[PDB]
Amino acid sequence: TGPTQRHTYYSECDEFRFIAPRVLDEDAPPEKRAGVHDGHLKRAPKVYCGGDERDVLRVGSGGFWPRRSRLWGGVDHAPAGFNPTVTVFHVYDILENVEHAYGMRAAQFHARFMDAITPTGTVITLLGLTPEGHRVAVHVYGTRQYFYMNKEEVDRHLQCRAPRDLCERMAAALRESPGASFRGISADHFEAEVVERTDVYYYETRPALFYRVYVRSGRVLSYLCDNFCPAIKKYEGGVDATTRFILDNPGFVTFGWYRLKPGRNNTLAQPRAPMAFGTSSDVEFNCTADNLAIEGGMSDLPAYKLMCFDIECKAGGEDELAFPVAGHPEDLVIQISCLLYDLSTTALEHVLLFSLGSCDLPESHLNELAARGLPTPVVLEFDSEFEMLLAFMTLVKQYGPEFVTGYNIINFDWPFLLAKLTDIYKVPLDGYGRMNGRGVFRVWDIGQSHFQKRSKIKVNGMVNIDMYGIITDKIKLSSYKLNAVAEAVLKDKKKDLSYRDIPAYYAAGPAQRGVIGEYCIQDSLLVGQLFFKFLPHLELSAVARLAGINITRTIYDGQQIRVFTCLLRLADQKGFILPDTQGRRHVGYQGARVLDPTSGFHVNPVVVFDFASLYPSIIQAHNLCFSTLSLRADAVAHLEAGKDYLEIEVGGRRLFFVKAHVRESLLSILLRDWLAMRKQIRSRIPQSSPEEAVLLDKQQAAIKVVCNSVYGFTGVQHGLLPCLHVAATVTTIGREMLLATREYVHARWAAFEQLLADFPEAADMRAPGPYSMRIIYGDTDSIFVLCRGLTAAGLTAVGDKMASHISRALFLPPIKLECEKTFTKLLLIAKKKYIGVIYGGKMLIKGVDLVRKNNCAFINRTSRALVDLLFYDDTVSGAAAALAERPAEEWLARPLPEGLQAFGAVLVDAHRRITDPERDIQDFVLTAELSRHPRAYTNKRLAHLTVYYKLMARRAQVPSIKDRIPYVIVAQTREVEETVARLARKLLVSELAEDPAYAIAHGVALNTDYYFSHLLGAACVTFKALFGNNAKITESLLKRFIPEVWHPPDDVAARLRTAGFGAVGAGATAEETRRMLHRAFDTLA
Template sequence: ESVVSEWRRPPFPDLDPEKDPIIFQQLDLEHYTDDKTPDGMPAPQGGTAPVIRMFGVTAEGHSILCHFHGFLPYFYVKAMAGFKVGLALMCSKFLKITVAVPRLVATTKRMLETGFRTQTYPEHCYSAFESFIDFEIRYSSLLLFQIFRFMTDTGVTGCNWIELVPGKYQVRAGCEMTTSAQLEVDVLWNEFTSHPPDGDWQKIAPIRILSFDIECAGRKGVFPVPNIDPVIQIASVVKKPFIKTIFTLNSCSTIVGSKVFSFRDEKEMLQAFTDFVCAVDPDIISGYNIQNFDLPYLINRANHLKVAKFPYLGRIKDCVTKIEGDEYSNRSKMGSRESEAKLTWREGVQFDALLREQKLRSYTLNAVSFHFLGEQKEDVHHSIITELQNGSAQTRRRLAVYCLKDAFLPIRLLDKLMFIINYMEMARVTGVPLSYLLTRGQSIKVISQLLRKTKEVDLLMPVIPTSNNDEFTGATVIEPIKGYYNQPIATLDFSSLYPSIMQAHNLCYTTLLMKNSKEKENLGPDDFIKTPSGDFFVKSHIRMGLLPEILESLLSARRNAKAMMKVETDPFKRSVLDGRQLALKISCNSVYGFTGAQVGKLPCLEISGSVTAFGRMMIDQTKRHVETQYTVENGYAHNAKVIYGDTDSVMVKFGVATVAESMALGKEAADLVSEKFVKPIKLEFEKVYYPYLLINKKRYAGLYFSSSSEVHDKMDCKGIETVRRDNAPLTANLISTCLQKLLINRDPEGAVDHAKEVISDLLCNRIDISQLIITKELTKTKEEYAAKQAHVELAERMKKRDAGSAPQLGDRVPFVIVCGAKGQAAYLKSEDPIYVLENNLQIDTEHYLKHQLSQPLLRIFEPVLGEAKAQSVLLKGDHTRVKKVVSGKVMGGLMAFAKKRVTCIGCKAVLPKDGAVCVHCETRESQIYQKEIAKLSSLEEKFSRLWTQCQRCQGSLHEEVICTSRDCPIFYMRKKVRIDLESQSSVLRRFGSAAW
């Protein structure tokens, strides 16, 4: 206790429940049932009572848990015939069915749907509305809905502020507490205030985040197993207050700025860590890959060692942190990543899952840190970890520093990317609890908004049986007029095309006129529209759609947020607002996707199909308008031509020479076209590309001008190798540099020269291996792949070598292509880059030229140089001469053969016996020796430079480098030089003492 007490939250001040309100920011909600309730709260009916518990933090940083009582689950069924008046939509009455606990919803619904008779009415099959038990085996989806129901009925949105009114809440005494929160209270479900996140209520409470990382002492070549391999270190970093701690097995030297706790016994260490977590009482637990590795490992290990009190990492007393998902996992892409640990009452933020939203070539902690923080981290192989552990207090300290860094980086990344702010804003905007954003998909957000809206206007959401088969047509991509345009190209975009179509034409579930609809017969021709896909919707003067209303409120909130951002001076508040406007934009765009999601809760292809059909028509019309208006005939200097367009944009060549002219015409055209469409559809001038290289559909590059200034804003590349992650960095970099030379410097010769130089470097083996690494995601298991693939086959081979470090499902697999038999398939020639270095395998440079460089290069050069010239200039000539490299070890058998033939170091003549030089070279042996010595020292110098660079990265210049990061180019260079050094030393050894 003395160890951990200093990090407890500040004590809760004295509270008078009759006078003091309790105000807190709510972070999560959960549903549970209890067989008893406190005095003054509704008693359980029929055994158990449903309770909603809400966790939150006050502005002063106190943790609080609130139990809401008396909120019963309910749903609706369509009433039997005989009821006269009804709700607008269904023209029928509904019966509200309330049950005692959620478990009864499913049975009740089934009973009602099967049908039965009552005394007053004949037998009737009732169809359920808003019952949300489409998956009856999954109880949790029902509880989820129960939480939504509570939130919509009480006006609670994700992460908003809650105020408990004096006299309306009861504080629990210590012995009645069920959790480790500082304060627990009981409230009636409708006797509190929920503040919408506006004005002052946009603030954010001080949230405590704990991030941790563990190290295990693994055995050589095997992935650590909790039943055997001990946990040796646990590092954790908390914010705020800022606390760095490390729990170590065996002694560990002190680390400045961190608390070191060393233990003789692993069980004690595990227990101390749990105690620490409970004392700190974090709101969010984070870490890299913790839910797939660290947490399950800790729990299984504690289980194995019988540390009974370990798994209580959550806030609920007597509630074990469980490992979830053995039953259903390992089948699909989503649920297949082994078992996951489920934390109760703390948000588990699996860090790498958040990072997957960013498109990166690699998702290792190292790669991500480098990308966002500009900082590498060490990657230590598990065999070295055991070595360091078995060393001294100093080597264990070395490990601890490394472990601490891994715990700290997720916190820094959370900050840097503003994940917490952005997710809270998303929760507030869409109304869903924070945790749903982390664990569920996009559609839950739309459902949440729809439920709130339907309640407002007294409508109910039907239960749609899931079915999929039907398809609907998407957007148009205008056939590009490919080529290199050395003139300004104006780009006009429909802003938020799909949302604005839905608004303009009042497209919604509630406005759709079904086939054979009786309503249509009673409507005049001006009361409804026929969409280009042949569906009918009533106009807004008859009935305003819900989706358009949702979109309107999202868009006006976004306009509002943007306006507030402009006047806000506090950078933190500004970033909150920026997060909000982004969240609003994303929510807007996901509404259309939701209507088209056939496996979702409420698919409506009439809506999504109409939206895309309108879009297609509008793009065609826009093209036609622009091309008929801007003509010589109409007094313009040139005939305008739409050279390309995709979904919501058109690229126009007005024929003018300057960016400014193009811009002026673009703005004019945008306004002209906007007028022809129903509000709020709006075509906007976006940017001018000059020059512009149009390679194909969805593939182009150009210099981006957003204003008529002299200089471009950036070079914009779409779909080209530079932005794709499935090629080697060599390709991406070369294409990027060539494009810069072509577009910015306007120097085709320079671009060609550079390409030739890189090709020559490649063929002469002068390219570093890190530039040649291709990565591809392992999207399914080997059996599921129809054809053989390079990365899949390699992953399989690596598994056989070392199951511990082999890539797993969902990982991106790095590989290079090595030499093999002539005409051998690429999937047989893929290899792990580290394996290539260690075994001195030859890279198949010709493969890289033929399959990685030539096509992309031709594609960008052909429009500039012409097909024939591009071919001949780039791919023929001296620079394509291959330098055959004699390798030390090729593959098994060959290597033995190579060893036998010792050659003279001076003239490469075969030597009859061991030694350095042949008879003819003996006279200049000393000279040859000096040359080889020089080579060695140059390699040594290179090695020491790289070594120092790695030391700098690890933050210490007097410790050995232990990093083996596969994402780091330095690592590969260091490894290569080291191998070269060794072979050079062995060359020198052959001279014997005579030479000097």
């Protein structure tokens, strides 16, 4: 007896490395309370809870944490007679594993399944729940991956007489292979057949014969695609078995409800015997895809569990204020907060606190939880780090949460745990996901990898969603510390324990450890709230369903694979095959036009016309595709120019795209079908229940995201299926449309009579002064129209009429120009930078310093005050309008208009406040993102890299790539000027940059010259446009507002006083100053 496949997680253990802080030994003398015990101990791991004690690994009648598991090692713990009928089940995740018939000998599988893995085979495991809440694994047999090769080419290269020859060639090529890994691979591991297909690129491409080659394993396929015949192009070799499973079966989804049913010859899904289970499921089945069907109409998410977790660590080395390192054995995980939620109800079900050492939670925290109706925290106590981590990994295995969240779990909390478990202890992680062994359980940091967009985690049956990743993609904050995000998003001020406070709290006995506990739990509850606000699983599952990829790939694998998989589905049913590129400079093509703005402060109404989904619509309107493009003029000679094809010059080359009635574009088909689907969904959101409306909203957003990605997909140099001819054509046409819109507007409505001839409703919009309608700005797909001589009040509607008129004048029917908004005032500063107020009253800020993350709170608030004056004070508005009456240089030589005194007042107040000694240093924190690994920078002398290396020197928490590094700029004292030459005059910003925590602690003074210069800079940049767009004039005129002060250095003043010099100015009555001059002139004489 025993499980068919060995379980690799720990079901038992009786020796382990005991590591524990010596400070937990309360009766020890202080001579012996430093550092950690570290030695091997021959006990079973224990856990303590409420005065009780258990083995961490025993499964039984008791238990300190919940379980949703049937097997444990080989023992079946289900109640006798447990045998649930499964009809419908929800799938949230899909695994693909290779099984071998020989390994499955003693599992009693029906011959149907054994055949499919006879030499070997790939098994798709659907992971899911029943509506009664049982965990399900359905093992689907019979999905093979395949790739294509052109028959003519391989027959020439290999001299194949038949499809069987090709299989012999392929087996041979794998047999004589380095590493010798394909031992005993045979021609019968392959099937090849001849099919007719077309390569998707170009309209001229003729259909041809290809060998389709079925392969039973991903390892094989990936090797053949790298190594078989590099000269011979391959098609679809990169497609995985899951994709094949999803696409080969109509309507099947990677996330959603399924039913089991009778298959081809009335075959049925076989229940696996518990000893043959691959996973920690309650029930498992063997089936083929014909035993499966989508259970349409079934809607709601089943009772999946979410674990929200957070670890806290303590350093153990000689320096206890150093940030803990994980690879250092003595830098221990001391607590793990673990919150278990039901995703279907949002209910918190369990609060579990793992603690190394005893830990009495404060009664105040227990009462707050009790008040909020939250379950009483179970506190689990451990004598050593290993027993605590083992217990946590055990809970993860036995409770098996389908979703895991936390905050910065991918960069910190998970890596630190896996480092301990794999480096210090030697625990194999491959059994700790859903599979019982051999599953993926892995973190990838960005590291040196030039390509990699984000850090990733894959745990085979466990969807990890990091709220740090979600939040930075949906809210713009200068800082993304959890407590800043809590204040910003949840509107909760919350205290947050410093890592430097933890050691003292730890060594201060159990109650203090309880305080660490309180913090850890409060953290995890905030993260719970964030999760249930944004409902990231609903967004992600919506995209997963639409794109036909699993939820995990939806989160970590990029944008391309989403379009690629949808394009693959459509290409298949059209008879096209997609080629694989072999192997692995600023821009590949010209992008959008941005018109030169008429820079200035506009107080006449400005209408904004903007094209809706411009690039998608262009792709549909002009039938753009791989399969519709030709480079050769020869290719379209049988067609009629104008009515059969577009001829267009792009990147200095003549391109042809045939129109839809010659061949319909695949990209066009995708976009049309999606946009139809989206309009259909949004038509139902009104007449829906609030619960259903949330889901529909998530669905329509998913469609929008996927439609938007299509243009980018074509533009990726070295991507999956690039076509820079399409990408360049899209932007070329867009450029032509933006200019066409401008030409039309200028010609047609140059005179008010002409506007009235089109729109009678304009007749009672006419304002005083001369009529003109001119385009002052435009960017990509928006155009801004200054409408002198019309009132803002009517403009919205007349502009919607004009937008619709321009539409049917100029552009083919998917293309649609819309009138989004009217500004009543607009400061058009520069390309991609403007501030304006919409006719309803709302301020819109674009591009400028006020909305950029980098700049500090002080400068932003002051800037927002100056802007709120220019737009929402009548007096200043008029004065700013009046600057424009004269050339900007004249304002250097005349008094600045009376109304702009208030704007002056704000700068004066900011100057006064910046040099306040009781300022709060948080107002002065600047930030920047580490875009890349610090040794991938060319210009090494940057403020954030300066702080990065200072943090690392100080063994502080080193920032991750993509984190925002906060800094302040410190006063250039002689002591600072020292430290710099102590690293081998006016120093660069980079040199005067410093960690704000350090700056607070050591009482380092801020550089007021920097921050005030930077204020006047932000002001100057924004309000250039009041003064002829001239920065030197603006800097001068703004600087004239500040009260200048002159007095000599105090030493000199003192010395002069001792030499009988008299005073003029302050410190004296004015008459004394007059008196003193009358002595001065005659003594100077």
